Design a protein around this ligand. Sequence first.
Ligand code: NKH
Ligand code: NKH
Lengths: 237, 243, 229, 240
Amino acid sequence: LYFQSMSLQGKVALVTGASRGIGQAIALELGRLGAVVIGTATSASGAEKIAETLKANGVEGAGLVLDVSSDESVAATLEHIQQHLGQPLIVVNNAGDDEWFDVVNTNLNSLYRLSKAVLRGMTKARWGRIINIGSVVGAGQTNYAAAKAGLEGFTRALAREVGSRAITVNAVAPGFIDTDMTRELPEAQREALLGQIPLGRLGQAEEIAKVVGFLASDGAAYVTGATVPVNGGMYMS
Amino acid sequence: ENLYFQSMSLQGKVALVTGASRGIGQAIALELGRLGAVVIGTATSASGAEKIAETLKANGVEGAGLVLDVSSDESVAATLEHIQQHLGQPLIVVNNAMKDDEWFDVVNTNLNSLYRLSKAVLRGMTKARWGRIINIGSVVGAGNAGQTNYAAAKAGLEGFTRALAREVGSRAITVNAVAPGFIDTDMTRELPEAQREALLGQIPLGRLGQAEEIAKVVGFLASDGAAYVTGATVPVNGGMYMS
Amino acid sequence: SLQGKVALVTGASRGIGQAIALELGRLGAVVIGTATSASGAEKIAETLKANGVEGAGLVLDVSSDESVAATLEHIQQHLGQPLIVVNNAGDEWFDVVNTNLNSLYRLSKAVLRGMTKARWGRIINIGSVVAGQTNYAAAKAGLEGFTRALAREVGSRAITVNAVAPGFIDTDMTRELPEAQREALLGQIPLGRLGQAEEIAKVVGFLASDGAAYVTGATVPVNGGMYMS
Amino acid sequence: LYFQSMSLQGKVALVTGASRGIGQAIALELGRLGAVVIGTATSASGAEKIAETLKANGVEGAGLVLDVSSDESVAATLEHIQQHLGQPLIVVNNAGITRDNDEWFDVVNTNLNSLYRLSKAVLRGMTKARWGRIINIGSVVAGQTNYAAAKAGLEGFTRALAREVGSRAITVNAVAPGFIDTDMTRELPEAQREALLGQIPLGRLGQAEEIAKVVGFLASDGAAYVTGATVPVNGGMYMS
Ligand SMILES: COc1cc(NC(=O)c2cccc3cccnc23)c(OC)cc1Cl
Ligand SMILES: COc1cc(NC(=O)c2cccc3cccnc23)c(OC)cc1Cl
């Protein structure tokens, strides 16, 4: 009957960058699995759009504004969530060439800032899921490889730090996924990229979201420090 | 009236699980049965086969237990034919079947058997334009000798899984692996406890994994939701990484 | 022969850094070794002298833009541009890695101008020697990825960027470890011993040579066969 | 008498597949470092060419016939070397087959089985001596699948063997080349050659000599604490 190792009934989930594509698909997948979902965006229109998308899909929750680069915004948002809905025990971080260093540095510093803030709730509860979403393939190769290596190593370290508390930390590393950014790449670049994917097609956003939905379940309780590649067989290093 | 047009489930899929008579294999066979697959579990002896049939029955899983020796082309071909005749083509296949100088033989044998089984099942999956091959790594099984063997089997399995994934991807067949850590099984239950505390101290979750926790990961990789996951090795080790 | 090259080695006052400074000097380089205190700088100058190596000991703090820029200027004025640079100087697990990578970047970017002008260079990053496991694995993963990314950025200029990842090496920190910990560690090392500082230095000496000109973005593990992920 | 001040004076080195390109460049590097070098080929003409090349370069040694897929040929060749020159304590495996000789699997399977066979046969001499160097050469860059597979197999194998023989002061390492300038690669059309270079941060092909230098180092006493490693030599081009 129940597919109970898959229920997120009774959990509150925070998904950053939820207004489109992968973030949005994740927010819906978690809602469908029975979570209350808070999706975030950096603008008020993104927040409002998120709330509408959740509504249209029968997902209870909210859309709110959050800037992951700001301690103040982070602390305030978490307070607001606490007051109105409870503590988020599932957090999905989806909010991301002499910039190559600064980009990775900035993204890992924001993962850390959001993660550390949410850990206190998860520690009290003795339960938690942190899931970090890598960037979609789309100079570019250097940045992509660097961000992916930083994310894997970061995810594994943080997993080690918080594991005694029954909190898992994992990542998902997408490949070429069909989104707004990728639909408008020049054809040459899109056809070259397809030619390197053994499945011979782009991934759907829903196919990232499924993986996230699994990692957030009780069935993935012994998986931690892992980076799961979701790339149709195309591995870029 | 016996017709059944499934959507996004394993309902009606036929799944073959090697080494299904105990522990991880058995937990996988039941998980796939619970997800609605018809399950053929295999063992190398007739008593194992019979035990698998009984376990499936007791749990309300439709399917069968059969004898299969993954090191033999004949046994493989025969077993596949029998499954075709009686149940249909298996489109989900799960391959689950003392010093530091045993590593070579062991890994060589296991990879050659993965290849042999995989190649035989690919024809059915190609015709159907759909498939799931899931390879299960071995559990940690001892200091040094054990570490060498484990790391070697794991490195071979990852590289092999990725290469096969590449070869069959164009056919909407995924190939993935699961790399367990320290799982609570027959071997681990009887370890000296003095040692057991040393082991736990290397695992961030501070416990052994359950066989069911490997089975859940396999259940997910077999689903439609995991369609864009291929060539991956998913570690299920509670955060303990040994290479 | 590194005859005619100027080599900067950070953290050169003892152990691995010192053995590297001597190995490069033995290969004919002029060597600037650095330390964070004036006594370290002076000790370096004395070690170099006692071994017949031309060069200098200076004070440098790799976490400060000012100290970096100043030191490089001083080297330029007095000796020329360093075209071989060996970086051996170094809640908490995050801040440690973050700080060390921000220092590698800071030093590296500052020395790249000299190397670009010369169309030749060698940057070699030294990892740290073996809770402890987490820190070690994290610093190692960060170093590998960073070394590879930088390699990519500067490769067109015939500059190589590589790292060396030591295992259990006989130094000041490891000499005083409790026996239990030392015997546990040995049991995991296939060569059944600690490495010598000179064994890291030799790897660095090879990476600095013309023979290693096609090696870039690599992390070479020097650990007697003991791998931790 | 004439004693080289190089890293391998007094050592005997066996290099398989020494009759051209990378294997030949290794044989000459090890000879230039003072080793006595036995280079091997599968045919008598290859063996003879190797002997001529070594002579022309002032390298003491020999060219012999060896088939790494045959236990008999292996044992025989090793015995001949012992009798006539001494035990090879440096062994470089460069006699990898390719898809030319289902295939992706058989290639890697065959090559790892030959590495194991040669390695196990030379380990007795190295154990007696309490010293050794085994160095495996990966293949140079469908093609991506084969290349990544051969590389992953070689890396895991090298590390496992390193573990098995380490207590004996024997090191086992590999070298993983990228795009190297060889007979095959010079002739490529411009379009294909410029595309290739654009994927290599150094912006050029490697020379065979540049692989040979890395092997030379790993064979020395200075690399005594390096074992189980795969050293990539690819100008910054990484594929997996
Ligand atoms: C892959 O290339 C990079 C990697 C890292 N950092 C890490 O990989 C990393 C890995 C593991 C822990 C970290 C903690 C703080 C910062 N970084 C890390 C990095 O640090 C920001 C910068 C670059 Cl360019
Ligand atoms: C990457 O793909 C492969 C890898 C291997 N083997 C290994 O990866 C391997 C890795 C480590 C130890 C081994 C011992 C015996 C045979 N193989 C191994 C392999 O074995 C023949 C076949 C393929 Cl396709």
